[PDB]
Amino acid sequence: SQQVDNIKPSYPLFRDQDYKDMLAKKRDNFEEKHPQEKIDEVFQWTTTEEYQELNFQREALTVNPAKACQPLGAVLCSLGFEKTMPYVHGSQGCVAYFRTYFNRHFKEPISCVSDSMTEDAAVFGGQQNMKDGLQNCKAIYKPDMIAVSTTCMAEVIGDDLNAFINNSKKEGHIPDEFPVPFAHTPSFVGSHVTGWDNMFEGIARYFTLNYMEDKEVGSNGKINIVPGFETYLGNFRVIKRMMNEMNVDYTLLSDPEEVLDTPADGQFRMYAGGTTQDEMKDAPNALNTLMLQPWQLTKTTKFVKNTWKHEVPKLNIPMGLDWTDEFLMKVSEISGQPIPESLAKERGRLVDMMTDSHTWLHGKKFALWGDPDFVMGMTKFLLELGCEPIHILCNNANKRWKKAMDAILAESPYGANSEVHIGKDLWHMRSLVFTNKPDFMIGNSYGKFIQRDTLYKGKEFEVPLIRIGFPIFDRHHLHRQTTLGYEGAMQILTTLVNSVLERLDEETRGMQTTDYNYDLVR
Amino acid sequence: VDNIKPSYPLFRDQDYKDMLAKKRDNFEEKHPQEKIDEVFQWTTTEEYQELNFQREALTVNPAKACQPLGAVLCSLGFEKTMPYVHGSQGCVAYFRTYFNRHFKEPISCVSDSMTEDAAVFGGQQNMKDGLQNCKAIYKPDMIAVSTTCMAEVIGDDLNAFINNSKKEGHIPDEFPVPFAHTPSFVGSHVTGWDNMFEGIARYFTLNYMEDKEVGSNGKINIVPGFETYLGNFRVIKRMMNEMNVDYTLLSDPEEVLDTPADGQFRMYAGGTTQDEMKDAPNALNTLMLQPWQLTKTTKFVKNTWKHEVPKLNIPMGLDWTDEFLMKVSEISGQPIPESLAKERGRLVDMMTDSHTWLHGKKFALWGDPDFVMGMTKFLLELGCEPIHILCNNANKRWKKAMDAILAESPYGANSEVHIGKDLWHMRSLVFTNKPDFMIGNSYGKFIQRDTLYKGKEFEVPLIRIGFPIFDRHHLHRQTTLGYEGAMQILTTLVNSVLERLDEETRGMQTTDYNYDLVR
Amino acid sequence: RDEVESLIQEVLEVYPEKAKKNREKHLSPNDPELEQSKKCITSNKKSLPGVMTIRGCAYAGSKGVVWGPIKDMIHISHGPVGCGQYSRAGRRNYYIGTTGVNAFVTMNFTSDFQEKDIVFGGDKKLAKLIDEIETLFPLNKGISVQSECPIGLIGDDIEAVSKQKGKEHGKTIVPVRCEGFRGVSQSLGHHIANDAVRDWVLSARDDDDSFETTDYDVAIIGDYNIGGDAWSSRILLEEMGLRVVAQWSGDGTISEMELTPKVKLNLVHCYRSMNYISRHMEEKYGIPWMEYNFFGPTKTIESLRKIAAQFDESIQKKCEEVIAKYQPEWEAVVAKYRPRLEGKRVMLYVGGLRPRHVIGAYEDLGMEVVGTGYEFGHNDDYDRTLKEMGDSTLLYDDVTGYEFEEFVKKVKPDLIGSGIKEKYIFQKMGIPFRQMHSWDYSGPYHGFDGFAIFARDMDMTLNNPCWKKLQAPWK
Amino acid sequence: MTGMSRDEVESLIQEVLEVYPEKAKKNREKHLSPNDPELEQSKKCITSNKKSLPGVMTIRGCAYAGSKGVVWGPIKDMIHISHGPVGCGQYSRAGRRNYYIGTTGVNAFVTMNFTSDFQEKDIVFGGDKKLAKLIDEIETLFPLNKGISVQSECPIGLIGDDIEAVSKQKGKEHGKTIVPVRCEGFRGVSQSLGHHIANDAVRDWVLSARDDDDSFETTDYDVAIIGDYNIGGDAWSSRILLEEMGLRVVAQWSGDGTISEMELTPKVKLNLVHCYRSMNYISRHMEEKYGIPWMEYNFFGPTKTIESLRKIAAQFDESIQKKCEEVIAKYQPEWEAVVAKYRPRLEGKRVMLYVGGLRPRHVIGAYEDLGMEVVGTGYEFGHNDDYDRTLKEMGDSTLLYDDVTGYEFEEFVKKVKPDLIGSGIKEKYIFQKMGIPFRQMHSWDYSGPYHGFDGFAIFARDMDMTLNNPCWKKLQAPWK
Ligand code: ICS
Ligand code: CLF
Ligand code: CLF
Ligand SMILES: [Fe+3]
Ligand SMILES: [Fe+3]
Secondary structure: EEEEEEEEOOOOOOOHHHHHHHHHHHHHHHHHOOOOHHHHHHHHHHHHHHHHHHHOOEEEEEEEOOOOOOHHHHHHOOEEEEEEEEEEEHHHHHHHHHHHHHHHHOOOOOOOOOOOOOOOHHHHHOOHHHHHHHHHHHHHHHHOOOEEEEOOHHHOOOOHHHHHHHHHHHHHOOOOOOOOOOOOOOEEEEEHHHHHHHHHHHHHHHHHHHOOOOOOOOOOOOEEOOOOOOHHHHHHHHHHHHHHOOOOOOEEEOOOOOOOOOOOOOOOOOOOEEEOHHHHHHHHOOOOOEOOOOHHHHHHHHHHHHHHOOOOOOOOOOOOOOHHHHHHHHHHHHHOOOHHHHHHHHHHHHHHHHHHHHHOOOOEEEEOOHHHHHHHHHHHHHHOOOOOOEEEEOOOOHHHHHHHHHHHHOHHHHHOOOOOOOOOOOHHHHHOOOHHOOOOOOOOOOOOHHHHHHHHHHHHHHHEEEOOOOOOOOOOOHHHHHOHHHHHHEEEEHHHHHHHHHHHHHHHOOOOOOOOOOOOOO | OOOOHHHHHHHOOOOHHEEEEEEHHHHOOOOOOOHHHHHHHOOHHHHHHHHHHHOOOEEOOOOOOOOHHHHHHHHOEEEEEEEEEEOOOHHHHHHHHHHHHOOOOOOOOOOOOOOOOOHHHHHHHHHHHHHHHHHHHHHOOOOEEHHHOOOOOOOOHHHHHHHHHHOOOOOOOOOOOOOOOOOOOOOOOOHHHHHHHHHHHHHHHHOOOOOOOOOOOOEEEEEEOOOOOOHHHHHHHHHHOOOOOOOOEEOOOOOOOOOOOOOOOOOOOOEHHHHHHHHHHHHOEEEEHHHHHOOOHHHHHHHOOOOOOOOOOOOOHHHHHHHHHHHHHHHHOOOOOOHHHHHHHHHHHHHHHHOOOOOOOEEEEEHHHHHHHHHHHHHHHOOOOEEEEEOOOOOOHHHHHHHHHHHHHHHOOEEHHHHHHHOOHHHHHHHHOOOOOEEEEEEHHHHHHHHHHHOOOOOOOOOOOOOOOOHHHHHHHHHOOOHHHOOOHHHHHHHHHHHHHHHHHHOOOOOOOOOOOOO | OOHHHHHHHHHHHOOHHHHHHHHOOOOOOOOOOOHHHHOOOOOOOOOEEEEEEEEOOOHHHHHHHHHHHOOOOOOEEEOOHHHHHOOOOOOOOOOOOOEOOOOOOOOOOEEOOOOOHHHHOOOHHHHHHHHHHHHHHOOOOOOEEEOHHHHHHHOHHHHHHHHHHHHHHHEEEEEEEEOOOOOOOHHHHHHHHHHHHHOOHHHOOOOOOOEEEEEEEOEEEEEOEEEOOOHHHHHHHOOOOOOEEEEEEOOOHHHHHHHHHHHEEEEEEOOOHHHHHHHHHHHHHOOOEEEOOOEEEHHHHHHHHHHHOOOOHHHHHHHHHHHHHEEEEEEEEHHHHHHOOOOOEEEEOOOHHHHOHHHHHHOOOOOOOEEEEEEEOOOHHHHHHHHHOOOEEEOOOOOOOOHHHHHHHOOOOOOEEEEEEHHHHHHOOOOEEEOOHHHHHOOOOOHHHHHHHHHHHHHHHHHHHHHHHHHOOOO | OOOOOHHHHHHHHHHHOOOOOOOHHHHOOEEEEEEOOOOOOOOHHOOOOOOOOOOOOOOOOOOOHHHHHHOOOOOOOEEEEEEEHHHHHHHHHOOEEEOOOOOOOEEEOOOOOOOOOOHHHHHHHHHHHHHHHHHHHHHHHHHOOOEEEEEEOHEEEEEOOOHHHHHHHHHHOOOOEEEEEEOOOOOOOOOOHHHHHHHHHHHOOOOOOOOOOOOOOOOOEEEEEEEEEEEEOHHHHHHHHHHHHOOEEEEEEEOOOOOOHHHHHHOOOOOOOOHHHHHHHHHHHHHHHHHOOEEOOOEHHOOOOOOOHHHHHHHHHHHHHHHHHHHHHHHHHHHHHHEEEEEHHHHOOOOEEEEEOOHHHOOHHHHHHHOOOOEEEEEEOOOOHHHHHHHHHHHOOOEEEEEOEHHHHHHHHHHOOOOEEEEEEHHHHHHOOOOEEEEEEEOOHHHOOEEEHHHHHHHHHHHHHHHOHHHHHHHHOOOO
8 A cells, every 4th residue: 555645665665564464475375485493594504604614615606706897897998088989899788788887886878889799690700790880880979989899709709809890991891090999808807807908908009009110208298197997986086186286297098087977968978088099199108107006907017018118117006195105206206296285285184184083993894895906905095094904805806916915914013814815706705794793894885785694693793884996886976986095095084984983873872771972072 | 802892882791781770770769761761752742842842941952052153263264363262261162172073173262261350350451461472372463352251241342452452562553453242142153253254354444445446356255154164165266266266265264174284283274364354345246155144244345345245145056056156257257167067067967866866855954044045955956855944043034035945946845944943842843743864963963862762763864964063074074065065965965865775674584675786 | 650750761861771771670650550560660680780779688688587586596697707797686676585595686696707617618617516506505496507608609518517416406407598699689588588497497396286276376477576566466466366376587486486387377467578488388287378567557457357357256356346445546646646747758668568568657647658669579569569659659679879869859758768778868968767677776666556656756757856957057 | 211301391391481471471480390209299399270371272161161061961860051151051062971871851961951042131131030931941841850950151140140049949849959050161260160169069959958868778888989970981980890899889970970879978988089179079078067088099090990999998897808809800810911912012102191180190000000101291270289199190300281371282292202192172183283192081082981990901902092003104295
């Protein structure tokens, strides 16, 4: 039943007694459900150390991975270039998932096309799909550039992207001069951040590899910045803002912030902003290139060092306090531009907030997951805050990354109780937060199911989720936030301390039981 | 060790529970828990609310401060200016502590420590010694004098006292000592800000109007009023800079309330210069960011500076930020840049992206008159229903304007505006006509505790927007003005709905359906 | 209307000659007097390469749509990590259970294929994975292996692994060859998933008559409980005196599917996804199946009476009792919201059922559907749409991103109902948008209780203040 | 490195005094002095309890803060009216962390702000009629309150209001205890006079309520905790130790205190005074009238706690003394583990303290139990007897500052260079900007309790957390 002035959505509607009786009858008569005592016993078992041992012994089954596949990262990289259409050579189901995935995180239109390879292309190849798809995409959406990646189907059948695109231009389906950079992005290798790295390297080598003769390092007086797979708009904005503050000429290659934040003013903009082809062409002329996320940009770093002859600095992700200092000083050294007093004031304000909030964050235990560079930066900032990241997880990191993380934790007294897990999913994380409970989780929206599980064991066992990372689906406009620089550190610091304070208020709201310590002032 | 428990988990141990139970049962002579429960249930009913709204002498949990607090904040907005409260020192200790806990920053303010001796002979000697000591010790460029209620009750003449201090050599004749009478039994803290600003503006410009020409410096004055969000000062400056509009933000405390921690303490930082105040009558116009709390300043600026002072609402939400930008554009002749149109469009895009989770949501809000009016206007723009609009400071004129704003919107039909009511009135309102959320300062946390105690389904979560915020950190850095402020408010509101929904749907096998990954 | 054909001609000029000639077959005005939609529109063909098609794949239609909602079964996304990750908890097929213990819908079980699995096969990895599932999730009641694209390309044999492991563990393991390249859309995923149900689950209790049966046993087929849609439909059916033995597949169990061959009537809500299993059950067990529509009071009342006519007079008497009981509720909803929605025009584009099933609900609020289309509807889907849509009204099969935008720019509807991939495109243009797949995370919309939510949601979005504020006042 | 010599401390005192005007410098010179442990009377080295100099950033509050904020407000079952304009009650609302157990708004009212909210009509024509009507509304809307206190703010004593007459009439009318407190903020020089006024209000209106009442059963081990305000549960950590010793804590006020506990105090055998400054007035009265001995005790740090517990137990029979050794032995491993964990990370650190009237000397033993040295201390409103007790508890040639100004305390810190500063919220953010770790000695930085053995673990954790926090090593920008 529905009251016209109290219309209930699904959650309060099905908690009505008539729906409760229906569901109980359905469960008891037809569902053949396991008895609730057995269900409770099994759930209690899944929270124990014995279950965790079996959980971590598995080698074939992945449960709730914290990673995506390569072409998703390639699409995001392609979206960072001016009037560029992401084009995934392969099956159309992948593109529908890529677009939907980015739709739900950014709440924005996501432009990406497939050439709809089917069972016929499984035996004959996707050459005809490439010729028709490139011609149709150019004719319909009129991009200045088509960036081609691959689905796993095209990779498994061994389609030659270079030959297919060359044959498309020779047979007149697209002009010979039309830029069609390509990258093989196999989804059974690496993760989405690997696809971003491959796509950027493909675009960079498309525009510069055969034109290195007239290039001179430092002739345009700029600094290239490669962000990598980045889903926070504020991270693109904070880097540009800091470079403008230092009066440092820069080129942000793969800049998607404009197209991922178009205004709603009565018009739809398929394209907005993005790195121009002239910017990519002139990139070898820069003084240097900075990898914002060096752990996911190894193929790009190898290409830039070997082809552009840029001495890419060994810079960490500019996260927290120390690494933002190192990034700013490295930018200052390369460009010769002094760090302005405004940035020193911003750093001092971040230090002031660190001082103001240190009592509520010291000793706080965190389990975190995400992409390798974000996780490393988050761990570094947590150590700077006196927090203990006790469960550091990265589904898509290698052993070299784990070695660097262990060195970072060894440098800090607050990393002594820390364990780094690589190649582990969020079902592994669920075991970790049950057996060695942190105060909070830092991760994407998939951690909400871990919080539900820990709450089900008990309120005193619930581990609240702090939503930092990708993807964020159950909150709105968090993609506008910043995690890089002093501004990003301030936003992270404010989120962390107020998560502690909000959790403490929830624990102390109980009248006459915990309402002492329900302090007005914290 | 390894589990050192602070107060909350420590006293929940069984040994402390047994101790507290024995203490209550043997010595406290407490009312029986059944009677306590019965009385609490009574205080949540409509019958209690009618008695609650019938009181005329008792105020319970007010949502306002006293005038000198606003005067101190206004004084802090001027360059190297020491707030100086003529009166008893207990007021200044409270003013500094109040601002210390909200801004998490040092707050400079001095008292002349008027005591029982000054209750009979006046505070003239305290003024002479205090001005001399304050100048010699802290070396301000300017001393802004307000009053505690003690000095106002005994009728101390600020003008005569400061004049006698200069005549007898305790301070130089040319040293600027603006003053304002700020009686705490009149108005509220925002009234003190208005009085202090009018006193400073009058001090620097009233006797120097002869050579002033309106619009000769080509700038626009901005008077923010009592503002405790650093981002509000920042957003106004940023918007004027991107419009290439020359402006003068009078009473700009942004820098001194956000000094960096770099091994040095800065008692003074930034602030409106005395030349800026002196040249203010030469501006094209003056804009009151919070016109309802700036009436005395508005009257002075219109009648002395001969500035038109357009009837502008607070630049909050979408419509009123549009009006502010178009009024700035009209006065300065500078077109609104495409960057601001893009920022407005992004705010509209977020309004579109979040409208399904905000439509129909019921809010009880309180705070200062202009912030409440702007919050109500933005809530109506979002399709939300502000059902309990409370303002302890506002007059009947403000209530009339709010009723007109609500009458203009179909989402204001179920709205009631309360003036002269405190947060105990608000507690009854959220019990008898329950909103989904309350927007207010940290004092609302006790209302949430009460509504949770009645039941989880009755709990009204508090969204912390306003002043003061004591139980959260660095919220004073955020913005409520402009498109950026509207975006921050929207993000806070929609994610408060989503976080509350996740809390209600986290229960495994009971409400874990609708615990959606995608919202 | 010649005007609609003129619009179709104008949007067609952008395409190259080969792409254009293909697309004219998929756009046509609606002719209610036409009996066969083959003579006006063409469907279920291959998507043109290089266009922003909205369609998914066979894996999305099998794992996402049919198998995934089965709560007591673990569904392995067999292959690389991508497909299972993007489809994890994305459909809102509601269920009741303890996730990770006896329910696994919002979970992402995957084999996470690496290069070694692509090069040397993943049959051994699949066998090991099933063992790990048995150890770590012992309360699962069955396992499905949803093949992603590489599985059918590297020559893996998941049927042999499923057979051996099912006998070894005494479990039902369903190999589904739903490789995303197999068809042209999610539609073939429905057929592959339905055949997997028939070949591995449906005949489990053929020689088992222990389940007690009544004359009023029904099974809901093709209702995936989107926001509790099947629960809102089930309460109406059981208030009518019927016993809903099974529902496919939202909130469904493996045992419910095994009990379906014992019902008296199969109520098919989504014909497109589950007509395969309904025809098989009619030919094998003799169970009649009928299509029903619980969108809006008018369709719900008609379907309830049509269902009750399949039983004795006692059920028909209870049907009039249910209709009378809910009559004040939906009449109050209409009285409240029809004045705010009367005359508004809607353009719809959903998958294989909703482009035509929701039309009556819109017409109950005074609204008019001035255009509709299917991502993967067949000719029989468009046959059903012809009479449910007004004359000279736009129909678009497998509409591209460009075509749908151009149609909206000309038709100018007051509301668009479509998927998440076009939600934010038309919100930029200032047209109110309602998600017709996830119900914009609201719902349910089925039954009488769902109609109140539907009318509230249409009113909330269409009449939202945000839509009057897209133009800057100074522009 | 040796601590500052006496000569260097006087030299530092002279330098800070230079910028003062001559009249101000002469006054301030009497309030700064090196510590002389060999000195018996602090009058000959430092001067206290004088008027604050005008125009200086004094940290002191007012008599209203010392009466309403300190003594009366923590009484949970009583409603306390901030009689006057809205400001005083608003700034003191829930700002102290006097912990209590109750249903707020029903039977407990500590974090509540009851005020008469004076307007100009109440200033001009008086607020006695408004106060009478206000008390009626309190009775109607809060019927479970067990008493009412009228805390006068500054205008009450200036406009000639008569709150004693209103309180007497309304108390008879409602059968309720109404305590008029003339704690107008201008009356004294600090919160200290607020303590005396509040104590006299307790004596004149509450303490005699059961003089002819003997129904309450009494034991030989009855004690009352006087002047413990349960800051973060301080009195609860102290009470558990006393009752483990076999004592019965009949009364504790004001922290978590009730009006009935205050009325039961004249029936105890011993009055344990933690804060002498705020409650020595009522303790002397109870000794002179009821013959109850009172003794000062210190539960800061294990060394002071053990000494105090043994000294308390010596006031009773051997059974209490035996239980005292059981309590000391039971908690010995707990605080020794705390010392073993945190003393290595705090040994040799130097701390400067500045709190109101008790904590500048009471917390010194806890710091010394952690290996730390207090190189400077001072009082906002401590009297000469407060400084008498500090002399022996404080190191030789150590800076002492009475009613220190904002300038003076900053200049002292710049020269002494302490590793840690313990002071109020008005000094917390000044010294954190200078890069010196700061701990609030009033609110315990919203941590605590610090009393007793359980409080010592929190205290050592808090000192280590702030002093050794990584934030302090990053104050300087690397490029600067
Ligand atoms: S199954 Fe089909 S696309 Fe019939 S794949 Fe799709 S939950 Fe649509 S129009 Mo999403 S044939 Fe169901 C459908 Fe309709 S996922 Fe749902 S809304 S009624
Ligand atoms: S059409 Fe469908 S969704 Fe596409 S792959 Fe094929 S079954 Fe799957 Fe999968 S991991 Fe990523 S998303 Fe693909 S490239 Fe492969
Ligand atoms: S010394 Fe003390 S705190 Fe000061 S007034 Fe006097 S009793 Fe009170 Fe009150 S309302 Fe505001 S804060 Fe004052 S100016 Fe008056
Ligand atoms: Fe958006
Ligand atoms: Fe600060």
